[PDB]
């Protein structure tokens, strides 16, 4: 029984990043974003109202495992805020199947979420982040004891598969190359000390320290708008106009930008941030998180990821 899940993700253009989950007895499927930036795990309820309308709702009366909880909950994001009240049922991904305590989603904003072909969130987060210290889902996996090691992995597809986590492992059909681990700063989130950024092979920024948040959940790379338009000037530039925008003759032309993430210099270049659109954003994070980068997708794409729960690190290795 030393165990290993695969679920595999659908690539919503190169913006979203998908799973399927199913909760309850027997399980209602629900499609989900897998977010190391959250601690919480919430889907839709039928008790909702709104975008309820587009998305998979939730129904505790055909779940024969479903203990009510019912105290309230507020999500927040910098793109939502989502509130309703506690619940508890089984979860089950990729084989693994844990009692979990979730938000039942009630009151859900009509604009972001509206066009969001994910139903609801699971969050790869730190009890730390989780509102009401719900003990997030892989603390809980991890207490089962039946995984391999305490790490789970992700794959970001380049838009044949779109994406994959594993839990328990790492795949090697879709790295290559060996793993270097950078250590969390501080526990409670994911997040390492970066050591400035080589908009060149001679810009740099943070030249100092600065920190970068490994979140999943987020479609760009971003950085402090103070930060980010100092990044788009020595570059190519063309301020907002649906958000930094080059030429597109001199899009091979754009040089590379390094992070320089504990020892090694993980870089990318124009092919993997130039869509013309930028795969580029600012977005001051405020404390407690805050100030900080945020690594999304647009990295993950270009280097396959290990989150090391047992040693409170982070890997990656290239993509492939
Ligand atoms: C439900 O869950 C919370 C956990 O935050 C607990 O403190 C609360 O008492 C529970 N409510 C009941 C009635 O089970």
Redesign the pocket.
């Known amino acids: 029984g030393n165990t290993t899940s695969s679920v595999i993700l659908t690539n919503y253009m190169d913006t979203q990043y998908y799973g399927e989950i199913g909760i309850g007895t027997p399980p209602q499927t629900f499609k989900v974003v897998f977010d190391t930036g959250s601690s919480n795990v919430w889907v839709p309820s039928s008790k909702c109202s709104t975008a309820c309308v587009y998305h998979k709702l939730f129904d505790a009366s055909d779940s024969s495992s479903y203990?009510?909880?019912?105290?309230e909950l507020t999500l927040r994001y910098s793109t939502g805020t989502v509130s309703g009240f506690?619940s508890?049922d089984i979860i089950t991904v990729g084989g693994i199947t844990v009692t979990q305590?979730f938000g039942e989603v009630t009151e859900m904003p009509a604009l972001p979420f509206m066009l969001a072909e994910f139903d609801g969130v699971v969050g790869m987060g730190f009890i730390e982040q989780a509102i009401?210290?719900?003990t997030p889902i892989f603390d809980n996996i991890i207490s089962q004891g039946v995984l391999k090691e305490d790490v789970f992995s992700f794959y970001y597809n380049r838009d044949s598969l779109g994406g994959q986590i594993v839990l328990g492992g790492s795949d090697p059909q879709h790295y290559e190359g060996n793993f270097h681990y950078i250590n969390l700063i501080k526990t409670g989130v994911w997040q390492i000390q970066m050591k400035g950024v080589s908009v060149g092979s001679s810009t740099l920024l943070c030249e100092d320290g600065c920190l970068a948040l490994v979140d999943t959940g987020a479609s760009y790379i971003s950085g402090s708008t103070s930060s980010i338009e100092k990044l788009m000037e020595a570059l190519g530039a063309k301020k907002r106009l649906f958000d930094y925008v080059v030429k597109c003759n001199e899009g091979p032309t754009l040089p590379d930008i390094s992070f320089h993430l504990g020892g090694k210099e993980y870089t990318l270049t124009s092919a993997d941030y130039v869509f013309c659109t930028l795969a580029i954003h600012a977005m001051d994070i405020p404390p407690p998180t805050g100030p900080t980068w945020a690594l999304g997708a647009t990295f993950i794409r270009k280097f396959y990821t290990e989150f090391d729960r047992r040693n409170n690190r982070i890997g990656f290795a290239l993509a492939r």
Do not use: A, P
Request: cysteine-free; hydrophobic content about 25%.
């Open positions: 203990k009510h909880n019912g105290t506690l508890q305590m009401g210290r719900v």
